[PDB]
Amino acid sequence: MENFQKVEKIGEGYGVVYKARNKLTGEVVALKKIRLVPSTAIREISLLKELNHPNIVKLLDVIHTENKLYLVFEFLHQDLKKFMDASALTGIPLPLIKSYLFQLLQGLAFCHSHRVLHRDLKPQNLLINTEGAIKLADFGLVVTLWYRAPEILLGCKYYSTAVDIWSLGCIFAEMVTRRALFPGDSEIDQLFRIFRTLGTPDEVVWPGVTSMPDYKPSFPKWARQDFSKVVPPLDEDGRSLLSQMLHYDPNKRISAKAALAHPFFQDVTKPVPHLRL
Ligand SMILES: CN(C)CCCOc1ccc(Nc2cc(-n3cnc4ccccc43)ncn2)nc1
Numbered sequence: 239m240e241n242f243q244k245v246e247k248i249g250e251g252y253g254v255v256y257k258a259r260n261k262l263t264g265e266v267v268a269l270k271k272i273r274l275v276p277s278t279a280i281r282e283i284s285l286l287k288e289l290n291h292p293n294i295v296k297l298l299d300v301i302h303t304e305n306k307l308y309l310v311f312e313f314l315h316q317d318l319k320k321f322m323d324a325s326a327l328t329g330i331p332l333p334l335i336k337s338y339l340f341q342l343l344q345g346l347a348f349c350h351s352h353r354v355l356h357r358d359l360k361p362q363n364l365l366i367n368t369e370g371a372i373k374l375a376d377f378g379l380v381v382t383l384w385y386r387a388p389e390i391l392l393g394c395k396y397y398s399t400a401v402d403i404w405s406l407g408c409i410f411a412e413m414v415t416r417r418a419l420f421p422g423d424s425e426i427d428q429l430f431r432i433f434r435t436l437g438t439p440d441e442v443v444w445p446g447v448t449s450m451p452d453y454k455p456s457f458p459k460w461a462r463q464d465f466s467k468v469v470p471p472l473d474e475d476g477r478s479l480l481s482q483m484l485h486y487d488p489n490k491r492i493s494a495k496a497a498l499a500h501p502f503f504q505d506v507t508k509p510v511p512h513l514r515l
Pocket residue numbers: 246247248249250251255268270295311312313314315316317320362363365375376
């Protein structure tokens with residue numbers, strides 16, 4: 239750790255993230271210092287060192303010395319939240335939205351084939367570079383609830399890869415409309431904003447929903463709205479894909495693999511963003 243010169247704090251993950259410079263090699267890195275280490279965590283983290291993909295932020299090194307754990311990652315120059323904020327007047331161009339969605343689906347398909355879930359996707363942990371890449375960071379082992387799948391909010395203990403597809407669907411919608419789709423500020427507010435837009439789920443659209451730990455018979459019954467109203471700028475292919483990413487039933491929700499084959503991507507390309515660094 240004496241090996242690293244902290245340049246600036248750039249975020250908060252289970253810890254704070256700094257831009258740092260390796261004092262010996264000259265490498266500029268993102269250094270995550272983890273909040274207070276269990277034998278189980280060390281071994282689980284070391285496996286993530288082998289989960290390498292073009293659309294996953296590269297974990298360069300794990301430094302367990304001595305009670306704290308630091309994760310040394312490759313440095314990317316901007317997060318998607320900042321890029322969306324910087325693009326808010328005109329919006330991110332559709333071709334670039336589509337490229338980013340496709341690449342994140344590639345990252346997830348990879349993670350999910352190895353039975354690794356992200357669990358907390360959000361614009362703040364999606365990182366972009368000047369050559370058009372976007373990468374997943376901060377794979378979990380005031381908290382934002384906006385991207386949380388309904389099965390998590392309803393108390394499902396053993397949720398699936400489908401949670402990440404839900405989160406990515408919410409992020410897709412946001413890139414398109416330039417407003418967060420479900421900006422809840424508590425778990426029930428989040429759940430009711432989902433219900434208000436997509437309809438209160440029942441046994442018809444989600445078999446077993448009424449048996450979920452935090453499901454109440456007394457939830458209000460809202461009707462579903464149209465996706466034409468929810469993401470107006472999006473063409474029918476994007477809306478179709480989005481609707482599949484936001485299916486209530488995690489077993490009907492589209493997989494990352496299947497989503498890559500969606501007709502929305504027939505004309506996918508890799509534009510380069512205009513980034514102000
Ligand atoms: C100073 N703030 C006003 C700026 C706001 C945020 O701006 C930036 C600019 C550049 C980067 N770069 C990164 C970050 C990561 N990373 C690894 N685990 C993470 C967990 C959370 C977030 C990022 C995480 N990995 C590689 N590159 N991250 C944020």
